[PDB]
């Protein structure tokens with residue numbers, strides 16, 4: 025059968041979910057910053 | 066301080082003293098060392114099969 | 115059928131006969147006594163390895179046969195100058211031939227002729243499979259001394275660069291021991307250091323030493339995780355010639371090993387080993403099934419029997435909790451043959467036919483059908 | 492010895508030992524002579540002196556991890572995308588300072604410190620947004636290091652070189668490649684056994700172009716990487732596979748027939764010699780001879796463990812460090828010059 | 831320090847070499863499986879009669 029002996033690399037797309045998580049965290053950080061700025065007005 | 070202690074370190078300022086405080090962070094560090102050497106093992110076992 | 119080479123199934127209940135795989139063997143056993151001439155005639159049908167050999171021999175040699183199974187005997191032991199069993203039936207001019215497990219030796223060859231051995235059989239030990247633990251030297255295995263000595267010399271030259279840093283620009287001195295402790299800590303994930311004062315070459319310099327520490331440590335862990343997995347191998351004993359059997363008392367609480375008394379293996383041992391036979395008699399055991407049960411419960415440490423039966427028993431055992439060190443190190447390796455009549459004319463033809471079977475490669479197929487099991491891997 | 496057609500005449504005559512035994516030039520054969528069927532026609536082989544089989548013999552190889560670099564389990568795009576990613580995060584942490592709720596050089600030092608696990612740097616962001624940003628960035632320096640180590644230790648685990656030939660049913664043996672030279676000793680029992688088979692004969696056509704003129708020359712050529720597999724008896728291969736520590740038998744014996752003293756079909760010696768050998772196999776005389784000559788081991792246990800990382804494959808990080816010292820000296824001249 | 835790190839790197843390689851070799855079993859394949867030609871007692875398996 026199809027053997028799983030594959031030296032798989034981690035290409036720019038094989039591991040990209042972490043970057044989407046970082047982008048969502050940056051968006052949430054901007055939202056928290058604008059909320060704090062509105063609260064400080 | 067506790068968020069840093071689970072992702073191996075950032076730059077915290079710790080308990081003032083007080084044996085319950087230092088002890089309390091020390092046993093949180095012992096659950097951080099096991100949690101992180103268990104995720105790495107589990108990630109190394111999926112990537113393979 | 116006292117050996118796992120020929121078996122006995124009474125008869126297919128579909129047609130009242132047996133299939134085209136076995137051959138009808140007449141179980142002509144005297145049941146009750148000699149009161150009548152009734153041989154207890156119940157036509158069974160035998161099959162297996164010796165049966166297939168016999169059926170191949172008759173087609174390669176033109177003859178017929180009728181299996182007169184057995185009467186008052188198992189293999190034949192000389193008692194009061196009289197032979198019984200297969201040898202007794204052959205020597206009395208009543209059988210003219212015998213097949214199965216004969217374990218050819220000198221006493222049987224004295225009065226009964228023999229063909230060429232078609233299978234090997236000697237004295238093999240059977241022990242449980244010892245679990246394979248990791249080597250005591252494994253932490254210092256996944257990295258050669260070259261890597262360690264360079265890492266050390268790189269640490270030294272980086273300390274030299276740090277003591278050269280003392281002549282930097284305007285921005286507790288930064289001594290050699292402090293930098294060594296800081297770099298020793300940075301490779302074993304952290305201790306408690308005090309770092310470069312400032313000075314972009316100093317902070318940068320420790321920062322790129324930290325980048326070689328992160329790669330060195332995630333590479334040792336990967337290499338340690340790749341050895342621990344693959345390597346696994348161990349052996350309990352080397353055979354009857356090892357010091358474990360020659361010197362039983364010169365160890366931890368001594369081993370226990372015994373065979374089935376009143377047999378061939380016990381006779382040879384007693385003939386060529388006095389202290390071994392004494393120690394075996396000090397730990398005698400029951401039949402092969404009771405011996406396997408004793409090996410399973412951790413009561414016996416090594417079982418002694420013939421190679422073929424032990425291999426067959428270990429091939430079909432539950433799981434693979436049995437081992438047989440055996441293989442090349444078998445003692446008194448005899449063979450099984452077809453006991454032809456003394457001074458007969460069919461001996462040459464039958465041994466030539468056996469050698470011809472051996473030539474083309476059918477006996478390997480017969481072994482792969484009737485002699486291998488689950489633990490063949 | 493075997494049967495071969497003569498060059499000029501029509502009748503077929505035996506060769507070597509068989510010919511010298513038949514043609515009244517020898518009364519006995521005291522030598523390892525595997526009992527066969529084509530030889531028992533004219534020879535009366537006694538009971539076998541020792542049992543053995545036919546096994547292959549290949550050379551032992553160095554594990555040779557072949558890592559060749561450290562950024563080996565990352566693909567050059569991922570190593571570059573992460574760097575601009577440190578700075579974007581650093582410049583964002585710096586920009587989250589002018590607005591009301593940290594110093595830009597120090598905020599970019601802190602992103603370098605949190606992802607290289609270094610202890611350098613001082614100060615933490617004070618705004619809640621930058622605090623959450625650093626709180627999730629820590630989570631990403633650790634996903635990059637835990638992911639780089641599981642990928643490095645799942646390519647160091649699956650780095651098995653190959654699977655050597657086992658037995659005779661291996662499909663790579665029944666139909667071998669062109670650059671897989673392997674042969675046997677001309678005029679022997681293995682030759683007749685391969686010439687007798689059906690498909691093994693279709694492979695035996697291929698072996699036949701090169702077969703060594705003797706077992707010793709074949710064992711010598713196997714070490715020199717000129718022969719890839721040698722099929723012979725196993726009493727001689729076990730002695731070759733022990734002394735040299737670079738020869739190991741991979742396959743399992745598939746032709747079980749031992750040697751035997753063979754004299755011509757009519758002689759009185761034929762009867763007493765089979766009893767001497769049967770009687771002397773039982774009283775351990777053959778065991779004494781085997782312990783004296785045949786088996787004294789000097790290399791064994793077949794560790795076959797994976798490769799230990801050597802300084803030839805892990806020199807990239809040392810080059811990176813040496814490189815760090817050299818650029819550090821130019822940076823010290825810039826610091827003096829900038830100061 | 832060198833020994834706190836050998837204990838943690840060794841505890842993680844042992845944990846991730848017992849999590850790698852934790853395969854449950856190997857299911858029956860084809861018909862030449864030795865476990866099918868001679869099955870155990872607690873291995874009930876049958877077909878549709880006639």
Ligand SMILES: *[C@@H]1O[C@H](CO)[C@@H](O)[C@H](O)[C@H]1NC(C)=O
Pocket residue numbers: 243244245
């Ligand atoms: C090997 O491990 C199995 C696991 O259950 C255990 O039952 C057995 O007793 C062990 N044997 C030895 C010799 O440690």
